[PDB]
Amino acid sequence: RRTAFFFDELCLWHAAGPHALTLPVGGWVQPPAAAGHAESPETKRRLKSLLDVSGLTARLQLRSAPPASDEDLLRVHPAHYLERFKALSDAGGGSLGQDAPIGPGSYEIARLSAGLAIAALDAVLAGEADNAYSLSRPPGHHCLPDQAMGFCFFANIAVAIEAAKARHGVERVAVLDWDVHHGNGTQAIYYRRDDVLSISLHQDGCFPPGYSGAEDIGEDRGRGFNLNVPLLPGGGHDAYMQAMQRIVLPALERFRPQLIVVASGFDANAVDPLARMQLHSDSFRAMTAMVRDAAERHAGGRLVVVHEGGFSEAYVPFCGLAVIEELSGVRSAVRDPLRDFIELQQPNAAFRDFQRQRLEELAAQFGLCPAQPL
Amino acid sequence: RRTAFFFDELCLWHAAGPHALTLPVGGWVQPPAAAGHAESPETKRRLKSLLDVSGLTARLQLRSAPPASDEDLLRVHPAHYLERFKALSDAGGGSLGQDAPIGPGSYEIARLSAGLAIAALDAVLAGEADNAYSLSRPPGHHCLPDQAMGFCFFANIAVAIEAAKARHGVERVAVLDWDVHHGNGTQAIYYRRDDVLSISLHQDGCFPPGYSGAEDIGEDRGRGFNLNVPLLPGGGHDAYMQAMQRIVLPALERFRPQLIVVASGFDANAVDPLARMQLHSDSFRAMTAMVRDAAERHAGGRLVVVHEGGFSEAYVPFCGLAVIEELSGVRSAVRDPLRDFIELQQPNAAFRDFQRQRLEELAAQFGLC
Amino acid sequence: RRTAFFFDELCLWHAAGPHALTLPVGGWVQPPAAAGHAESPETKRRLKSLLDVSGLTARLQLRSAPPASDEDLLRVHPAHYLERFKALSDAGGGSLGQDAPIGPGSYEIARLSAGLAIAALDAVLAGEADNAYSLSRPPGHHCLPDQAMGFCFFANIAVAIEAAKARHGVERVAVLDWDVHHGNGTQAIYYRRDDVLSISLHQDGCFPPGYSGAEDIGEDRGRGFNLNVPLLPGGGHDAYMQAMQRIVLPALERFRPQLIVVASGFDANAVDPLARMQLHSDSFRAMTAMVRDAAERHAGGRLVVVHEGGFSEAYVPFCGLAVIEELSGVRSAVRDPLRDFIELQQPNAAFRDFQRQRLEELAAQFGLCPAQPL
Amino acid sequence: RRTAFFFDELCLWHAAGPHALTLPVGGWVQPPAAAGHAESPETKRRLKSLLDVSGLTARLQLRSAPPASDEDLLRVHPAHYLERFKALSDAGGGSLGQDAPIGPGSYEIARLSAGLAIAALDAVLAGEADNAYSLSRPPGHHCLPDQAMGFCFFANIAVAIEAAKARHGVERVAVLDWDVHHGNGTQAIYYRRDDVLSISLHQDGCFPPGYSGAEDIGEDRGRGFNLNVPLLPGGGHDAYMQAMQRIVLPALERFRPQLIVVASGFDANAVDPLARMQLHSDSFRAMTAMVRDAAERHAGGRLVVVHEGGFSEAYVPFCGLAVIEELSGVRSAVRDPLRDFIELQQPNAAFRDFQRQRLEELAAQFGLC
Ligand SMILES: [K+]
Ligand SMILES: [K+]
Ligand SMILES: [K+]
Ligand SMILES: [K+]
Ligand SMILES: [K+]
Ligand SMILES: [K+]
Ligand SMILES: [K+]
Ligand SMILES: [K+]
Ligand SMILES: [Zn+2]
Ligand SMILES: [Zn+2]
Ligand SMILES: [Zn+2]
Ligand SMILES: [Zn+2]
């Protein structure tokens, strides 16, 4: 297949002020001697490097894009949010919102991240590639129209969708968000809309803290077009496969997407500090295969994967590689050195059965019929 | 209370070859730009820093200790193991076992780590302090007598207990291991002994990978004096409180320890990369209060906490501080900034009930119902 | 001897926003993947750690101090500077001046750094120790009353001296500044004063860039009580010894200090990125011995060494250790692993002779008589 | 101009054991919390990043190359040296020589580094490009045929030249080494050869420590075809411009090279920890312009620049970018933020005159007056 890889080196240069993991430094939180801010470029840089030495980058359609225009940004964000962000960015950086720290030139880099998402959807809708992967940093799926949060400063996917509707007139877009945290920004923006189906798989109560959201299925015109699957902390491969089979694929069947966008965070991986799930790289590969198959059946193959979270520098690269291998249909020589180990750590039969029963009940609560793909 | 804090700066100088998290650099694992090895000194360094900035250090009895002697080390490890270890340490470093990488001078630092645990048990048994905390790096609880593993190179706790028995004649010691991984080293060494009650709370199947171990309760003379509590991945405060109340405290009540040693890893904390559990600093505070209460009821208050794992640089310091506050009975001005956040992320009622039912069934299997 | 070591762990927690070495990140300067800001705590932390494993810390009078009061700070700085700094500090950090970046809680840490300097002078004047070393971070010697610069936010030494005059009534204080950069703050503050002799040895034109300053000997009441020795870039051990013998010791002889304060930066060391000089740890040891001897002859031994610059994490600890060994009269087992190597790199005879002749001429320009110590 | 840029991502994955700057971690040198080894990949990584963000990459001919063959390597190094190197690389790493530490897989990466230099010379000799830049890590110019040193494990330039001579029959090659340290490897290999003019500009006595070398002009057949210019520590733009104008360009004029290779270290830059010189990005720009002009006058424009040292993560990228701009004749939007600062810090008139006089005396000693 022809997979477009949207990347820009400048996205790897965004960096907020001092933070111990996610905690802003100051008060009782000592400055890290080595690491720094959780939303680090290193994870994304190590993904890019691995894609290069694996030979996969050479088999992709490597592309950049112009930064998002104010016009594109103003579809979702107000001008005063843009001016504030810009002011803080030009001032040297600071705090923009709830866990939304920025540095100098963060405005420009945020615009570029959104621009990559816009271009990726565009390329796939124009027929310039069968599918695409956008290595967007900073990420977007937590950002509300007037509030930065969770290290997201623009609602990247929303911005790209609004631009895609204005340029191409696409009527039905499915957004599957498998970042381990709740896609609250996407949910809120499209909550009363039936032209975008927003699905989030997330760790129950992880981020935003305490939010599960199963009963939040959208409202009025959007009722049934938002679906939250709050997975129990500690779940892994089987929990996600069962979620994909019992909820996601049936929701997609009913919706008939013309384009599928995946908010692909890799923070459900088994060594991530910011969640408690147990996925391995083959979990991501299998989720991508299922969504690629869905895109081929409904949307003429039109699939865009946008990079969101993932904070294990060691392991995120293997997970991202697996997704890109699956999009492109090229298998590299890279073997995941943690895969066998993570297999042994998975929930036991009793726990897996408990989670399976909860997903069966959730599928029934959503009114989803267990048919197969066609 | 008089709390002894055993520490040596030189423990913070042990450093392996290049690793990304726990993956040795080589093949497809790129060298890290910044971090380096999983068992970094920075977690233990940041705890000590927080203890000093909080002022708690001024209220502790600060102590150090000589390195462990060969005599002490030879109560558990063979001469050839020491030789092999020292040769590799002198050679610039390498891999002494499975997930057991060492740097130059790692032998001498491992001896210092073990000596601190020996000295801390001795201090408490001699009445120099009511209780103690040993900042022992590298850790010990995975180390077998002739096999390093899981970043452990000597069986620190075992060596300390064997030394304490030789020195003081202590008859009953309980070891509570709340490091999130299974205390396989301690379990193996004392598996057929009834003078040492070994209890491990651990994430089911985490490390060693795939091992749960509820069925392994000891053998012959030690039958009933080993207890594994394999907790479901994803559990947090309630799971550990229920494990403590239904299993640990009743087990300790029955054994009547003369001394309690805690293998205190902090890797059950909610942001640790090496496990999937959801503890906060107050969970560690409460587990310390509970075991301190056990020690006061059976052991004349004689409790030693030996630092084991914990790989969140950001959060381990707050968990360690909570333990030391509870040991000393002194509350600093430090407030855990993640505490309220982690409370909100805890397992829901259904998951809590599921885990509770499993612990009830397990306590009945152990005959503690 | 009884050497007081003024230290607080909290001084090692100060950390500005993102900087590649000294360059603020943004524009063309990529965020460092590992290091971070030049004014890093690591150098000072590695000094403390080395003092501990060497056994030297156990032989010192280890002390902390309260933070500097507003009253102490207001002797040199205006209230509006304090309020601005505080505001920026409470806002999360930012830029306070010319190469003066701050983080959150920097105000509190800056106050503590000044407080350590105040307490060190006080302890030595009170007779509580023969001499003292203050591990002050952030440093002070570049900071003007109303302008932060060169990573200095309060004029630490000036603040401590003004407090010492108010508390103890000390009449003559010599400040020897062997940090490799020009002590511009101390110079400016005491420029028309004869109660403080300010001497700076620095790399000619290094920082502030282009400033040599040999002709700037003080004015009116202060004329002859400021001395700048601009050493040629590339100089090392011999250049500093000749400066000490031909300029510093004679200036001290004439001045008759009641207290000597050393602004001890270690950035003249041979591997420092922020200067081009070639000192080794025995250079610092010899400078300390000469100033300790001067303090014993004039000032009843009253000597305070205040830590200023030094940005080689590998080597600064060895240089600081040498100074503290010399103050205390305790020789540790630590041997400097670069000492022999740095010896071989020193300027050749021709270059050493060129520098010596320039220093002879400068001594004559200052009207300094080449007598010996008595 | 058509500028070939030879690069491989995998060169940025070579990483030694723990070092503080150039000091091996062990004894009194504490492990770094953050940095690690002097010869870090981050300087070369940041140059490549800056080349991409500046857009200059789009105007270069991007190339890679196979690793050097044994045949190519054996033109300079013995089989046993390769064996010893590969055994130590396979063993997890260690010390292959003096100031020559290696990690796991370092052998394969060193071969790739050498192959890039071979390919870059070949490309320019074949007319595939007018000139070339090789981002060869690890570096080469200190490496002797049977002794690694100064973080160099193969003599990259020597291997490339020997390969170029075997492949193309090139008769006269000039090597200009403006790395701040002495190009001892190149000098030794070609010391008695007149087919290779080796010139080193270096800080007097820096590395190897204590070596100046003005008197060492080659021997027998090579007498006059080695030139050392030992510059006083502390010099900057003017010292290097005067060295180029009075010594390098007249030497090149006399030799009439058919190809010019530059061993381009950037460690003469004003903020480098491993030397005491005061160059800025425009000094490197001007040295490149001057040698490019030499190459156009004698060598049909055939110039290859091989990356050597440079240990300022912050500043080397701007110096490297300046060289590549000058090679390609394309000026990016990147502005060197230290440029004006470093201008102000330059030696004063008296020091400049002192150095100028020494270079005049040296040029007369070489017979270039
Ligand atoms: K999600
Ligand atoms: K919707
Ligand atoms: K355990
Ligand atoms: K037992
Ligand atoms: K100075
Ligand atoms: K003065
Ligand atoms: K050179
Ligand atoms: K030659
Ligand atoms: Zn996430
Ligand atoms: Zn553990
Ligand atoms: Zn300085
Ligand atoms: Zn060099």
Structure at a glance:
Chain A has about 375 residues and is an alpha/beta fold. The first copy, chain A, has helices at about 40-55, 70-75, 80-90, 105-125, 155-170, 185-190, 235-255, 280-300, 315-330, 340-345, 350-365; strands spanning about 5, 20, 25, 60-65, 95, 100, 130-135, 175, 195-205, 225-230, 260-265, 305.
Give your account of this protein's structure.
Four copies of one chain form a homotetramer. In chain A, the strands form three sheets. An eight-stranded parallel beta sheet of chain A has the order 4-1-7-12-11-8-9-10, with helices on both faces. A two-stranded antiparallel sheet of chain A has the order 2-3. In chain A, strands 5-6 form a two-stranded antiparallel ribbon. Chain A is globular and about 55 Å long. The first copy, chain A, is of the alpha/beta class and 374 residues long. The first copy, chain A, contains eleven helices and twelve strands. Chain A is 38% helix and 14% strand. Chain A has one domain (1-374): Histone deacetylase domain (Arginase, Chain A), CATH 3.40.800. In chain A, a hairpin with a 2-residue loop joins strand 5 and strand 6. Chains in contact: A-B, A-C, A-D, B-C, B-D, C-D. At the A-B interface, helix 1 and helix 11 of A face helix 1 and helix 11 of B. The structure holds potassium ion (K) (8 copies) and zinc ion (ZN) (4 copies). One potassium ion is lined by residues 190-191, 193, 196-198, 218, 222, 225-226 of chain D.
